[PDB]
Amino acid sequence: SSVVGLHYKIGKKIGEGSFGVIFEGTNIINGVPVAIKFEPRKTEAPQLRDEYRTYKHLQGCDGIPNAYYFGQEGLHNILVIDLLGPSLEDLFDWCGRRFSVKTVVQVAIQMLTLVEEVHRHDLIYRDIKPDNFLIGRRGATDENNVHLIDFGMAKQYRDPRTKQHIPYREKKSLSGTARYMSINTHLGREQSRRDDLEALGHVFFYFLRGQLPWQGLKAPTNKQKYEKIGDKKRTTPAVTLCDGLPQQFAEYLDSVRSLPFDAEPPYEEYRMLLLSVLDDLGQACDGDMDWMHLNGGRGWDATINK
Ligand SMILES: Fc1ccc(-c2nc3cc(F)ccn3c2-c2ccncc2)cc1
Numbered sequence: 001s002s003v004v005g006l007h008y009k010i011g012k013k014i015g016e017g018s019f020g021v022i023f024e025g026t027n028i029i030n031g032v033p034v035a036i037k038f039e040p041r042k043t044e045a046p047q048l049r050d051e052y053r054t055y056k057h058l059q060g061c062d063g064i065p066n067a068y069y070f071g072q073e074g075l076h077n078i079l080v081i082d083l084l085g086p087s088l089e090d091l092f093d094w095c096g097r098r099f100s101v102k103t104v105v106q107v108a109i110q111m112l113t114l115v116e117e118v119h120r121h122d123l124i125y126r127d128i129k130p131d132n133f134l135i136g137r138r139g140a141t142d143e144n145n146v147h148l149i150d151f152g153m154a155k156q157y158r159d160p161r162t163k164q165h166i167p168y169r170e171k172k173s174l175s176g177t178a179r180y181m182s183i184n185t186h187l188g189r190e191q192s193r194r195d196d197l198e199a200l201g202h203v204f205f206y207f208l209r210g211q212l213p214w215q216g217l218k219a220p221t222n223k224q225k226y227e228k229i230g231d232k233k234r235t236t237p238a239v240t241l242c243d244g245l246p247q248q249f250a251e252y253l254d255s256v257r258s259l260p261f262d263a264e265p266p267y268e269e270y271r272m273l274l275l276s277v278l279d280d281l282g283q284a285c286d287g288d289m290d291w292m293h294l295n296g297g298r299g300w301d302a303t304i305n306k
């Protein structure tokens with residue numbers, strides 16, 4: 001049968017989660033579209049049952065989609081959530097692999113707020129990348145707002161009732177994407193709130209410069225490539241990465257790298273630091289983003305851009 005979760009018809013396949021069986025769906029009750037997620041049963045890495053419970057925990061938070069169904073169906077686990085638009089990596093490629101200063105700033109402030117809400121619910125993300133940040137759908141009220149999805153790497157960091165941080169430890173397996181992970185993750189240290197914020201700092205320079213200096217290194221094995229990548233991050237100060245860029249981006253990365261392990265980041269102060277970039281350059285924060293000027297003003301297309 002084509003109907004799963006009682007009320008959800010399976011449509012076309014959308015991927016972008018390894019080859020995880022993701023689809024576009026349609027609630028046969030009201031017609032709203034969804035994003036159906038399958039997971040093979042009796043697999044070596046079961047994580048769908050817990051990703052559901054993370055969406056219910058963050059249910060009601062802005063930028064986090066709602067979870068609507070989870071149950072057994074044949075030899076698969078199915079999770080129905082909201083359907084969202086392209087990723088920041090998708091819009092990045094379509095704008096020439098370079099974002100202007102105003103759009104990097106405006107997106108940065110929304111990404112900081114989404115990460116803070118995750119931290120207020122006793123969770124850290126541990127997989128910061130623009131591929132997991134999506135806008136909304138065309139014609140919707142949240143069409144160009146930034147959303148956060150995929151919490152298969154999210155990790156509890158403090159007790160929900162005592163608010164006591166997890167103890168510091170080392171000698172852990174490398175977890176995340178090598179291009180954006182913090183220096184502390186390269187060293188096999190326990191991740192905390194400060195590492196999500198440093199990963200966000202690497203994404204900002206990735207948008208401004210179009211590339212990062214630790215891209216395209218040669219190494220015979222995989223382990224030696226992550227070492228060589230983390231080495232370039234300790235040799236490059238924040239000032240050189242900020243060459244020809246507003247120095248507040250260098251101040252941000254340096255500050256989040258000086259945070260203690262169990263310290264609480266000054267989120268509002270970081271967002272005010274990134275806002276003053278627009279004041280120094282005579283710009284307003286009205287919400288105008290670069291991808292809003294694609295294709296003569298129509299916006300992003302299907303067959304021309306994808
Ligand atoms: F239940 C789920 C859980 C995760 C997804 C998902 N994963 C990725 C990975 C990606 F690189 C890009 C996009 N997405 C989605 C996604 C796509 C469209 N609209 C909502 C979410 C979907 C459904």
Ligand SMILES: [Cl-]
Pocket residue numbers: 179214215216
């Ligand atoms: Cl790379």
